[PDB]
DNA sequence: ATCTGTACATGTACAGAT
DNA sequence: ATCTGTACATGTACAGAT
DNA sequence: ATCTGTACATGTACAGAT
DNA sequence: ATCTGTACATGTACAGAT
């Protein structure tokens, strides 16, 4: 009930969703196909829709986008940067509308995001039908964020990603373990769709700093927040509901209004609650420990397993289980017993942070 | 425990398998390669398996195979055959054949024929014409004999015809997103070669859903997991096979059940798993009571003389036009009989 | 004259609105 | 409960290219 | 266009554990 | 008797090479 209301509260507005997605696909259409013109580097990208809002978990407002626009890249190899798994040198065998951004057979990401960026940046002051400008580049940042002022703000990242359709990579091999969940043909149908590769583009000054790329699944997690229920009926029409799409977004908005008060926060993101709730969902793979009467238990038992992750020290990538999220290496102990003790207040107190 | 022991005696040989299909992949890739690598007609035409082999619910032996040559045809109109449900004119290479099916058919037919002549590693020869099938059957000696049906089918890709609107009522049982993107594939006609003497018998076609139904047949749970090994077992297809099994005794022993065929029992089947949606319904430790009631609503088929097409609901395979009230009387003695007795004739 | 990338045309699940 | 806008998958038409 | 290479589904088969 | 784990076999989707 109280649950219900928040909901509720975070239910976003058709007539907001109508005047937002009018303005944004107007820009992304005008970018997209000005990388098809002449002699771009970019032609062949492509448009993949991702995130919250093409996930329908988007919550309070419609005014955050994210778009891939995807480069398929034949004929590629990767090696692993330093074991972590998550981050691969690009390289290339033969010898080319990409050559300006080799460096000696391996592909800079900064240098091909610059590119990006500058095209981008180009086509956004020609545009004078919308009020809308790009963000100063944020370290760690795969994208090209613009900030529309549709009087409404919005922000809409274009990601830049390499597309190789060749198998996963190892790395890769022991993640998505949703057999017991989903099934084994389904795991089958989506490690044979493409992967792919968007720029880690960090700043700390480590050795192939502007050469290094990131896995990415955004398109894994679309297709699996659409198709998440042991039940092929799972929130259909003739099916029953759930409340797992429901349990994400009240987690999504705790750690949003939390991040908005405490910049002690700042080394989290909602992904760590998206990767949560797909492990979450694995271990709880019936459509029953998701009934839409048991809304509390469900989001209590997704908190009680976030805190013994902060706790632990341990989150796992998803899709490549190697790769701890919540490592010291990334986010440091007192950030992390910090959120702990900001959860489990909430948790024992009634969630007074939903009534801000 | 007795169904049990029945299911192990239906069970294909993993020795049986192999040499069958090696057997019939040989004659299979030659006729299709003949089919494009020789100005022909059906100069695109692709492969696609079908039937019981295919959805693993063939029983006893691998001795009949069924295979699709379909052929994308583009802008064709469909006209429906006096509101058949399941018949159609075709209008719009083919130039030579509104499309008949029977010339169609012919030349087709011809192509086979004269390929099989050049055989010389396997003993297969081609089986002679039945009035009321759409394919070309090839008789396989591999010692074992083996039929295999090469069915000529037009692709559509196009909406399905209006008479389907109402078919496939998959919505609680597999959902609308299947049935949303099954329906998005394509859809196929194949000859009505009827012999009956009645008006355009010799240009209608016949839709065909076999690629939809292979689908459903290996993906027929409720549960993404149904039937996966990181799943649990249902007993769906032991039932098919079980009910497969008494059609097929009861026809080997009695001409009187020559209008009834296996396609009548997959498409009750279908009915039932509509019914009883629930993977819990079609626990293996149930597999008695399944099967009987899969036996009882059979039963209330013949009754009422009411059988639809599972994709094409006004299309009764049950009408007298069809099958005589007296044919179906006749099953349902025998049935009731086999059920009320231990199904004796599950020992022969 | 034919070929074809681009974008219209069609249909419907999802979920907000009434 | 029904009505309805957006997203998205897939089929097709045609201006501009060849 | 046409074909092999790859990966894993669907099966059968059998021994050791239950 | 059934369950589990490994071996063994064919079918099928699609990337990539020619
Ligand atoms: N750190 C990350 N590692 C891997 N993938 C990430 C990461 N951050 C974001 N992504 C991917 O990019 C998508 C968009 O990122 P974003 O931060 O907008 O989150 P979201 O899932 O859209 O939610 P919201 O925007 O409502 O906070 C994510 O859904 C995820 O697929
Ligand atoms: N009367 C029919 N109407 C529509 N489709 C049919 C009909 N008969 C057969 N088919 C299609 O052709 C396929 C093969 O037919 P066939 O008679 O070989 O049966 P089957 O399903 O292969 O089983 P079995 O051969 O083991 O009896 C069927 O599964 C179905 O897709
Ligand atoms: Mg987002
Ligand atoms: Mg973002
Ligand atoms: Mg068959
Ligand atoms: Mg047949
Ligand atoms: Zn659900
Ligand atoms: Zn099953």
């Given at each position: 009930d109280k649950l219900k209301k928040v909901l509720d509260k975070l239910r976003l507005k058709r007539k907001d969703i109508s005047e937002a997605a009018e303005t944004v696909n107007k820009v992304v259409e005008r970018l997209l196909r000005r990388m098809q013109k002449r002699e771009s580097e970019f032609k062949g990208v492509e448009q993949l829709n991702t995130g919250s809002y093409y996930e329908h978990v988007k919550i309070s407002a419609p005014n955050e986008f994210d778009v891939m626009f995807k480069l398929e890249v034949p004929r590629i190899e990767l090696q692993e940067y330093y074991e972590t798994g998550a981050f691969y040198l690009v390289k290339f065998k033969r010898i080319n509308p990409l050559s300006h951004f080799l460096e000696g057979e391996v592909l800079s990401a900064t240098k091909m995001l610059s590119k990006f960026r500058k095209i981008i940046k180009e086509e956004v002051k020609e545009i004078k039908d919308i009020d809308v400008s790009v963000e100063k580049e944020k370290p760690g940042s795969p994208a090209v964020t613009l900030l529309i002022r549709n009087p409404e703000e919005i922000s809409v990242d274009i990601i830049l990603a390499l597309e190789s359709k060749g198998s996963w990579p190892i790395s890769t091999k022991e993640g998505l373990p949703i057999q017991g969940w989903l099934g084994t043909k389904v795991r089958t149908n989506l490690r044979r769709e493409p992967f792919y590769l968007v720029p880690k583009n960090a700043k700390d000054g480590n050795s192939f700093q502007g050469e290094t790329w990131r896995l990415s699944f955004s398109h894994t997690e679309k297709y699996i927040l659409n198709n998440?229920?042991?039940?092929?009926?799972?929130?259909?029409s003739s099916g029953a509901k759930c409340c797992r799409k429901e349990c994400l977004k009240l987690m999504k908005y705790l750690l949003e209004q939390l991040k908005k008060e405490f910049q002690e926060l700042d080394a989290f993101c909602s992904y760590h609650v998206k990767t949560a709730i797909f492990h979450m969902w694995t271990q709880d793979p019936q459509d029953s420990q998701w009934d839409p009467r048991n809304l509390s238990s469900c989001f209590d038992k997704l908190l009680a397993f976030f805190l013994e992750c902060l706790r632990t020290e341990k989150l796992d990538h998803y899709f490549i289980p190697k790769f701890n999220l919540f490592s010291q290496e990334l986010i440091d102990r007192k950030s992390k017993e910090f959120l702990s003790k900001k959860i489990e207040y909430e948790r024992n107190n009634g969630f007074p942070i939903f009534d801000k």
């Open positions: 998440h229920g042991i039940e092929k009926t799972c929130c259909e």
